[PDB]
Structure 1
């Protein structure tokens, strides 16, 4: 049996992860749950799975949680704060850490798991994007194995040969017959929206993905295709790919999750229902397999699968992220930090949908800072670009 600490257990991926455990009691046991403010969800999960520990990031939420748990007679002890999260990710009995906190806030707890040599089920993409080579150095230095959870990177992982799978980010693609990595695809809920209508799209409209049920941040990133930009940066670190070995493709139907080109013409791909339990269960069981709760993909009830090239006028964010990689880690760290702030601003109805890409570009220009040489510098650049992002948000606020 394998034992998990789940970071961000109350989110969409954390809930999908717990459902995989729920469908496989004899293979998986949850030792610790870690979240932020969602008390009702955490108390559902603590009473159900009886974890040893439960962390809420915010102190007042931990108090409410302990009151309900101690009333029912639960054995789950409640802690709080960032360091508690880091300690839960480094427990001796833990075999796997589902890194599924949203944004760069999940960096430090995820790095604690990596320093303790845990198997990292990596979903929290903003952490790798913002930390870059320093994240990959930390994994190599320790005894830790990265298993990508993100639909796209998991699909690519499953379509890569074993020398790559067993030396992720350090193996050579060309030596193993890989020409490029094909990153798909959805294109968001405003794919077919007229360009001049994009600015009037509300948060509720941006969070209604046709195929995916996700958190709010990641759903807005799907709409702007900043998600694909962040996954592009991430894929280059995860799979040791250069700009010329990367491709980006819109696939509206979200059936194909991503692909890998090979020298002989072959393209290996992962397919299935647009449902995160599948890739989550891939990593939890790898190199074996388990049932995830997802039913078999019925090919006779599908929409015709199409592909199209991404239009940078429709998706200014994609361009921002792809060029931020060429600009370096300071700009990338600054971009991700800015995108976190502007997406939050958009959801709070402070700015318009298309203001996300305008203000993101603005923050990047106003940032002038040295390339991070350590994790502290990564957080200093992140903190400083958030300050700038907030100022710009208020420059477009009613």
Structure 2
């Protein structure tokens, strides 16, 4: 019977890629029902998407465009959706028995809260939002132990790759973010592939003076800066640890400039399995919705002969010290990942806005990490989410204070 889907952040990158692959797949046979759309504040696009997909639920976060939305939707003949607003609408969608799978394609607070409510409702959650895993991994783990039928399915491309390499007869004995995931799946080590970003050929003296322009000039600005500093991969290392329970000494970052091998899993016998395709978000999103099955697509087949050459090299931790900081934070454990994520949000934005230099990014983050003290990890879910929010806010303030002191 159908796959019933809600998209949170439907006008974002994840959201439109999801709707694209759904639409295309549905042309081949009707497998997907788009039951709910949720957007922040693109009331117009949401209306356009509603025309096409006609979900039972519409929701917009911003109350200031709530009335407008309702007014635009009247124009659609033969259509009486449930139209909702804000956090309250979010919760209603997540509690709907008609929804099976929820795509989280929003970031930050909205991202963690929708994820939380989707888990509390025992749904399958297709999560792209790595910062929520890095920052609030312990909270997600606890929730997933309370809500036994909820599952997080990874959509971040490298993590999708890893997941796609597994035997689902073993996956089904566990789930992502569970202790012992790697043990049950016989995983030994992970090769986490990277584009390497724009600065792999730059000397230290060149990196000293690179600018945000040099990094941007195709994805969002924040992830683009993180790809430039390789803090994206550093966050993706922590994401791997949490999703798959792989030790940090068994995660290896490898620079694969062609971006065809998306990542690789070494099993305990030392056999390596990898997932490969053109650089792509459609397959990761689609697999999150079809797992543990696959369905036909009309995607272009990989032409391995035409690709011709694949290359792999080790990243320099001197040139990309954000990688080292991510490992350090993850190995220290506790809430150090929360602090890393929060301090990077500030340092990334400073650099983006030409306030600091490349090596200042890692300097600031390092100084924030050094000032944090491990805290007792709460057993209680509500207390734990509070600790994470408090630490997150502290680390942002601290990063800002270190910036302002030097400046």
Fold-level similarity (TM above 0.5): yes
Q: 1:187 aligned to 2:193?
A: no
Q: Which residue of 2 aligns with 1:43?
A: 47
1:1-398 matches, within 5 Å, as 1-25=2-26, 26-62=30-66, 65-70=69-74, 75-103=80-108, 105-142=110-147, 143-166=149-172, 167-168=174-175, 169-171=178-180, 173-174=182-183, 176-207=185-216, 213-302=218-307, 304-368=309-373, 370-373=375-378, 374-395=384-405
Give me the whole-angstrom Cα distance separating, in 1, the residues matched to 2:250 and 2:37: 38
Give me the whole-angstrom Cα distance separating, in 2, the residues matched to 1:394 and 1:65: 42
Give me the whole-angstrom Cα distance separating, in 1, the residues matched to 2:295 and 2:116: 28
Structure 1 vs Structure 2 CA RMSD: 2.5
Give me the whole-angstrom Cα distance separating, in 2, the residues matched to 1:333 and 1:131: 7
Q: TM-score, normalised by structure 2?
A: 0.87
Give me the whole-angstrom Cα distance separating, in 1, the residues matched to 2:392 and 2:53: 35
How many corresponding residue pairs? 393
Aligned to 2:162, what secondary structure does the other structure show? helix
Aligned to 1:24, what secondary structure does the other structure show? helix
Aligned to 1:117, what secondary structure does the other structure show? coil
Which shifted more, 226-235 or 25-34?
A: 25-34
After superposition, the C-alpha distances for 1:74-126 in whole angstroms (9 at most, x for unaligned) are 64554333343233233221100112212354111101101100011121111
Give me the whole-angstrom Cα distance separating, in 2, the residues matched to 1:277 and 1:330: 33
After superposition, the C-alpha distances for 1:152-173 in whole angstroms (9 at most, x for unaligned) are 1111111122354221334453
After superposition, the C-alpha distances for 1:281-307 in whole angstroms (9 at most, x for unaligned) are 112112222245531111122252111
Please say if residues 50 and 75 of structure 1, whose CA atoms lie closer than 8 Å, have aligned partners that are also in contact.
no
Cα distance 1:344–1:31, how it changes in 2: closer, same or farther (>3 A)? Answer: farther
Cα distance 1:172–1:55, how it changes in 2: closer, same or farther (>3 A)? Answer: closer
User: Cα offset for 1:61?
Assistant: 4.6
Aligned to 1:51, what secondary structure does the other structure show? coil
Cα distance 1:31–1:336, how it changes in 2: closer, same or farther (>3 A)? Answer: same
Cα distance 1:284–1:195, how it changes in 2: closer, same or farther (>3 A)? Answer: same
User: Cα offset for 1:241?
Assistant: 1.3
Aligned to 2:262, what secondary structure does the other structure show? strand
Give me the whole-angstrom Cα distance separating, in 2, the residues matched to 1:257 and 1:321: 20
Aligned to 1:31, what secondary structure does the other structure show? strand
Larger radius of gyration: 2
Cα distance 1:129–1:104, how it changes in 2: closer, same or farther (>3 A)? Answer: farther
Please say if residues 124 and 150 of structure 2, whose CA atoms lie closer than 8 Å, have aligned partners that are also in contact.
yes
Q: TM-score, normalised by structure 1?
A: 0.89
Give me the whole-angstrom Cα distance separating, in 2, the residues matched to 1:293 and 1:246: 34
| Gap regions ≥5 residues in structure 1 | none
User: Cα offset for 1:394?
Assistant: 4.5
Aligned to 1:183, what secondary structure does the other structure show? strand
